[PDB]
């Protein structure tokens, strides 16, 4: 009983370091969560029942998503390799179930987060300033690494505590995250993290109400508008570019970064309108482009992209209305569960549970914002990291709220 808790708090402490710093750390963490499950031999049947207000919605959402993706492959004969990445979201079920069976200590998650962030900063600094690398990602893809950095920085920003030494240990998390993100480019992750950290400022300060948030976002908007009124400001330099890009797209000159991605979106949405219920199927987005009228009369980069670069548009065009609903569910059901746990924790006091729920909600929001400009299911590392993090956070939050 006690060893199950100790070997689980050690695992939650080591999870960020394994995921980021260790090369094959995802497999190591999977083996760790699977060997903890082999010691829950006598339990794990009396763990699901009392935590069925949190475990069952997650299991139902994951099973429905898997069934929809399998049914969008049975009807449209596709190679089985298109569902390997979706097959990795089943690990959220296992992670949450293991966590709820063996109660961890959430106080060791935050120290693990900050240690992982610091060590990843050191690794990226070495991989950029000495072994010159264009985009210094530790051992994985740049996009997946950036998403992991953003998610873990948000998690670390939700430090449970009020002492002066805790706020300066949570702002350091954002500082390390933004340094790591700027080291490997991918400014979109920086923008997403900075945007989604503003709602987190209510979790961060248990004095910061909603009016103080409305005025804060008003001040941010005023600062953003002030930049556009300075003629030489770089913000006006990267905003006028997008404005001119939109204007060029509104006539025939669609051969640009904004224009190319606003043209695959239109082709995807026009096909989704044609076939609402069943699209081409899971994956197979290239069929929409190759059967389109624009590609048959124009030679451009928009006809070579394997998949769309927006999660909602890609899901709607490829796997239809049921697939769109289940894809939105994979990100909305955890949000509802986190809100339900946060409300109970706040009604009970217990600042650790409230901070955990806030961190989960921020992770969900950041994942949605990232999916606004990319497909999360494309990268296996991103999928497995998201599944594991959501499972662990949901399990710990449910354990804190229920008891």
């Amino acid at each position, epitope marked *: 009983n006690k060893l199950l808790s100790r070997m689980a708090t050690v695992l939650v402490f080591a999870f960020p370091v394994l995921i980021l710093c260790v090369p094959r750390g995802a497999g190591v963490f999977l083996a760790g969560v699977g060997v903890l499950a082999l010691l829950g031999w006598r339990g794990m049947g009396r763990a699901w029942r009392e935590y069925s207000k949190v475990m069952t919605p997650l299991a139902i959402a994951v099973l429905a998503f898997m069934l929809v993706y399998v049914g969008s492959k049975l009807y449209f004969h596709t190679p089985w390799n298109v569902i390997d990445n979706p097959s990795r979201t089943l690990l959220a079920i296992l992670t949450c179930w293991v966590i709820v069976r063996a109660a961890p200590n959430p106080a060791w998650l935050w120290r693990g987060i900050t240690v992982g962030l610091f060590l990843a900063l050191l690794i990226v600094g070495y991989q950029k300033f000495a072994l010159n690398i264009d985009r210094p990602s530790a051992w994985i893809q740049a996009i997946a690494f950036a998403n992991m950095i953003a998610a873990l920085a948000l998690v670390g920003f939700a430090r449970p505590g009020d002492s002066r030494g805790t706020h300066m240990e949570a702002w350091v998390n954002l500082l390390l995250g933004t340094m790591i993100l700027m080291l490997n480019g991918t400014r979109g992750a920086v923008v997403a993290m900075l945007v989604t950290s503003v709602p987190m400022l209510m979790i961060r300060y248990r004095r910061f109400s909603v009016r103080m948030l409305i005025v804060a976002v008003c001040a941010v908007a005023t600062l953003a508008i002030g930049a556009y009124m300075v003629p030489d400001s770089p913000v006006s330099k990267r905003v006028d570019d997008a404005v001119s890009e939109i204007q060029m797209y509104r006539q025939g000159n669609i051969e640009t*970064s904004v224009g190319v991605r606003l043209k695959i979106w239109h082709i995807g949405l026009q096909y989704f309108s044609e076939h609402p219920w069943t699209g081409v199927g899971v994956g197979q987005f290239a069929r929409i482009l190759h059967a389109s009228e624009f590609c048959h009369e124009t030679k451009s980069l928009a006809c070579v992209l394997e998949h769309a670069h927006n999660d909602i548009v890609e899901a709607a065009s490829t796997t239809g209305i049921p697939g769109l609903m289940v894809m939105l569910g994979l990100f909305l059901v955890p949000a509802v569960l986190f809100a339900r746990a946060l409300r109970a924790a706040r009604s009970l006091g217990n600042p650790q549970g409230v901070s955990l729920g806030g961190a989960g909600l921020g992770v969900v929001m950041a994942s949605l914002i990232s999916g606004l*400009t990319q497909v999360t299911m494309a990268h296996q590392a991103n999928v497995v990291f998201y599944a594991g993090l959501i499972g662990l956070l949901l399990g710990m939050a449910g354990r804190e709220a229920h008891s």
Partner: antibody, heavy 119, light 104 residues
């Protein structure tokens, strides 16, 4: 989208010459410009480039300290200032523009220039 | 820097027989390998980016693959306009490097 460069000619060793790479159909300060040279009857060789927005510059081993790459958003042109020329720098110099960052995370040249000959 | 070797340095094959080009790498370049085709006296044109994705206006005959640090381009069949030199590049390191350049 078009990249046009001019400025090649006869330069005695120890001289200086500037190559201007005028661009059209896109914005230079948004993307990045890479310079690639090819010696007569030999393979392609990279020399320098600039970053998208920050303007950070990197140079090859042979040309560092003597080549000064720069950009001018007002005229939407990219320049490579060549200094302390030697007989080993005779090549045809091409421009290059990387693909969209979201399409390819790493740099890959998609539109090139017509190339200029420097002796 | 990072050094690549291409083999063969120059090959000769008739039309219809598939050819494969091997590009090596001194150090570990993950996926930042691009392939170009240069015809005599003209600017090179991009063929494959990220070692497995074709570019616009490139026939489906061209295809690339990765096996660890062994990057290989293959052509399903040679049409009369497929006779040109090919190069392989790394973009993982900040100082990019082109291959020696095979010839068909």
């Amino acid at each position: 989208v078009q990249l046009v460069e001019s400025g090649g000619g006869l330069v005695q060793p120890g001289g200086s010459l500037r190559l201007s790479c005028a661009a059209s159909g896109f914005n230079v300060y948004s993307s990045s410009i890479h310079w690639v040279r090819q010696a007569p009857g030999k393979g392609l060789e990279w020399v320098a480039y600039i970053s998208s927005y920050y303007g950070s510059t990197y140079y090859a081993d042979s040309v560092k300290g003597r080549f000064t790459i720069s950009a001018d958003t007002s005229k939407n042109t990219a320049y490579l200032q060549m200094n302390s020329l030697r007989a080993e720098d005779t090549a045809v110099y091409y421009c290059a523009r990387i693909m969209f960052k979201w399409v390819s995370p790493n740099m890959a040249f998609d539109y090139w220039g017509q190339g200029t000959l420097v002796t | 820097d990072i050094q690549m070797t291409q083999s063969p340095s120059s090959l000769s094959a008739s039309v219809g027989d598939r050819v494969t080009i091997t590009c090596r790498a001194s150090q570990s370049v993950s996926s930042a390998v691009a392939w170009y085709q240069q015809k005599p006296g003209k600017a090179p044109k991009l063929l494959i980016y990220s070692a497995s994705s074709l570019y616009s206006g490139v026939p489906s005959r061209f295809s690339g693959s990765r096996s660890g640090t062994d990057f290989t381009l293959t052509i399903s069949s040679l049409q009369p306009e497929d006779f040109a030199t090919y190069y392989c590049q790394q973009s993982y390191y900040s100082l990019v490097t082109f291959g020696q350049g095979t010839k068909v």
